[PDB]
Amino acid sequence: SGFRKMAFPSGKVEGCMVQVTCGTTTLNGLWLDDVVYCPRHVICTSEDMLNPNYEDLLIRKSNHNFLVQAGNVQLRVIGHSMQNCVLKLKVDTANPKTPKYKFVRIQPGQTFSVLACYNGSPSGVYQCAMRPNFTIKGSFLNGSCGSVGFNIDYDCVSFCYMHHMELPTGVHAGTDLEGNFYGPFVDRQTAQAAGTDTTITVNVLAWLYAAVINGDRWFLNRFTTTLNDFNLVAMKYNYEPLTQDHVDILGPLSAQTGIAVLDMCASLKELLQNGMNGRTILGSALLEDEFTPFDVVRQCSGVTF
Amino acid sequence: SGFRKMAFPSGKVEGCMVQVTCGTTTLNGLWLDDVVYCPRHVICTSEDMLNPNYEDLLIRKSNHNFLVQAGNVQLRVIGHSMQNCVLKLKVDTANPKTPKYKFVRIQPGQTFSVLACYNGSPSGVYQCAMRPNFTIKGSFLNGSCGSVGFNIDYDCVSFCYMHHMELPTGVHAGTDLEGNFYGPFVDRQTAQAAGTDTTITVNVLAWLYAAVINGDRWFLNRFTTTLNDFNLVAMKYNYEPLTQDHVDILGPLSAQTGIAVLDMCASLKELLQNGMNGRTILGSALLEDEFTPFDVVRQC
Ligand SMILES: N#Cc1cc(Cl)cc(CC(=O)Nc2cncc3ccccc23)c1
């Protein structure tokens, strides 16, 4: 029993965090094999960031301009290239702590753990989801750039996010490990705003199944709905459209609890139109959308890494 | 910006998790130097849990009765002793991944990260607080016994909790790393119930200061209160009595935001009276009590 926002054990990722310094800027890097990956804006000054020409700023740099530190050991940079918004520093030493890894690009609604770092030193781990507006509601201070997001699948660390910036609303923007930003964001000091956010419907339903598994059933009702009628209601409440793929992915949870996906949709429909009425679900007065159906199954089954 | 329930990086603790097997029972152990620490109920069977005699059950065991598995390597047990409710298995190999550590006993209201494990394999990490009723609202399934709670401060891992049991309400009970249970609990199948839980007042106040640091002030009011009047109102909402020690600990946050501790207490009193009226504080519709004043200063 118990339901917590649980992150993957960060250990395999901690052994990859390094500190990258270019001039006066100090951020984090991810050391995998003989390459250190970090945001390309590490080469920018505050004046350069206003209108950066990264090929021009990078051509002016040499290997010894990049100070890389793995704990208390300085790594020597022997090459440097740029792939989209990520700077790839070739180093002379291969990271002996390199885990089995893959670079994956996640879709909005997908969750991941973030290992927040400052000066190549991990300070905390938390779980979060890629919002439908492509931002993450993270917890980041200055120096956190280069901190990464990941999932652990068996023994393989799938790196899915690298932190680059904070938007004026306090939400965060970053890229996959190939340097492609999530969302309509650019790495420059300019007017960028997150779009209007929506609630991840499939995740709220998954969390409602986790509440039923934990003995919270007050919200269940005798009613069912059609997938189209639910989506007309969901669109009204800024909820993401629930697709047939979402209904299929919720199948194991539906079979485990005996509550059909469209039966759970009618509970959500009533919660949206009437509220919780002073009640909580899993100790929460809001409908939680940062647990995917797989997170619910993994946490309510006991999968280890 | 942003405020999240953040756990400590679990890496230093992951390198200590081992699997301990005694007969048919399999739970987790914490391998530090040449000692593996695990709940003493690993030696218990079916007709044992009701009224076990651990000295009697342990005297019947030998070193080779304990199978310890660190990853895919079986560790050889060369000694075994009991310290309160923890079984201490002396092993022939010192853990090369042993971090700088200390065993600390925490007080209710204090927070820590839990590295949930099954079969000596870490599956997840989460943050939580020692409730005023000495239980933890964890997320634990069968086989999680021996999973530990910890804090990391200045490269040192302070081990503060070892999971022992789940109470009938779904909350969890465990011990410090010296085997002393938190609360009036025992490692027996006897009728054990958690006492009435209360909200950690000092933590709600700390979280209200974190909201002011992140730019939220909607809940503040022109009022102040006396410490005694606040406690008379707090008791009516099942809130822990706020002590002068709590008021002192909130001093740095009070000075940073410019909001006196008893002024923030007046906002809490009002928030308890009115609720949030459709608003949220740090993305939450409830008053959060699992962030200590120290966590707020650390994260903000
Ligand atoms: N009688 C008795 C007795 C006494 C002790 Cl000290 C421990 C246990 C096992 C026990 O409750 N551990 C488990 C730990 N955490 C979550 C659990 C969720 C389902 C099932 C078991 C869980 C039973």
Ligand SMILES: [Cl-]
């Ligand atoms: Cl009220």
